[PDB]
Amino acid sequence: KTVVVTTILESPYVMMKKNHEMLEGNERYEGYCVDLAAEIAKHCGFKYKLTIVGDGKYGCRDADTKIWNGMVGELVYGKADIAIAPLTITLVREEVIDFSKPFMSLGISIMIKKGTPIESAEDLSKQTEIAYGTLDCGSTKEFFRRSKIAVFDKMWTYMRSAEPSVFVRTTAEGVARVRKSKGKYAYLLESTMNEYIEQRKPCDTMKVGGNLDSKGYGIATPKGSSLGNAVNLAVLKLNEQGLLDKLKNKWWYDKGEC
């Protein structure tokens, strides 16, 4: 049985190869998660097909219908066998899908245009001149909506009611708004993407302050799927043999532009 893998286009995790239109199947793609997928499959002994998630989303649960969208949904509704992506391990997801132990550590972080007078979340919350927001339908937004810590709740209260919207649809959309906003927009996003963008031309953004929380990405499978045990052991083996650090270097730093 060819394992159906859901994933999403997000640099440097999964990206289209330059000559993708001349290539077929799995060969169309490259990146951290493409390399990780090849290694998981070889170590667990399965054949697989990478498929980009149809709605371009990670997965949130619609309040009204309570239907799950994105990669989480593809797993919940039986459309995919496994998701290999920068999918954040969270409580509400773990209630509907299974995760491996994390293959990468991260935290929510602040991205500014260089020179923006902000050094922390506390700084953002006590001022109004510089706008700030997060991605829609992700763990970052849910972290702010749920948090009971004063600084973060105060930030949430601001963001939910800010007009125009401070929320963006895609990482690229948030980074353009930082760049294009002359220092008047700050972007809350995971440290891993922040670090990657900081190493890319035009070299005008930077991560400031410490991370706001601490969590991980995991490989997800449908609840009670039998693939989960093998996949979990593989991730731990690969971490032990240093493959995950090798890959992070390859995709983030070995070719940093800054």
Added chain:
Amino acid sequence: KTVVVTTILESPYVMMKKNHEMLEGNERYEGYCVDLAAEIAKHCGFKYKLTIVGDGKYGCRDADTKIWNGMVGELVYGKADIAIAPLTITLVREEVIDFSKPFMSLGISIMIKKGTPIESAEDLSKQTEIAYGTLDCGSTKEFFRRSKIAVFDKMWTYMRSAEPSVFVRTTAEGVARVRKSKGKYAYLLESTMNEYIEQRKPCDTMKVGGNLDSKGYGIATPKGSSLGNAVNLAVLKLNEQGLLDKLKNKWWYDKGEC
């Protein structure tokens, strides 16, 4: 049924309170893991007894008999229900017991006596006037034995053969040895422990370099135990509410002596 918890005396995870001899049961102890346990029991709704592991070990498998010792053994052989301790999630353990998602991140790091001329593992591996070692029967020693990375493999050869032994039975033993070696012993240990000790009188040690690897501590239960699911969901909730972060501030930095 009262849940039996195996743990181990290791600062600042589990320590006897100054007035323990006046106190009874779970009240004799305090620390990060003591607070963590009360939180897990509360959210999973259970009553528990904290018991210090008889042999004072975390857990490794005897090569001849294949028998597991320490906290891992207590779980495997049916003597405890759960382990709450700085127990490293590793491949070999995950084969015989279950772990929650990590409640704390860490890496292998180098502890030196302030002033020692060492900046990295490379630096250790390329000289021999400074001795260095690790704890017996833990995940750090196994890391160096199993490591196919040139530098880490190189150190392993030196360490296994060295005489006298560069290995230690306890964290305290390693730390003392550093402190009295007048700079000619460096100790390889987990970053969490390193950081804690750095903030304690007589403030003569420091962590140097970045971490050699990235891993996590997890709460362990016997394979296929029912407690596993709730405990896991409980670790994610606590992390999400910032409690794990509050606890680490409480126990590492809030009362630092340096």
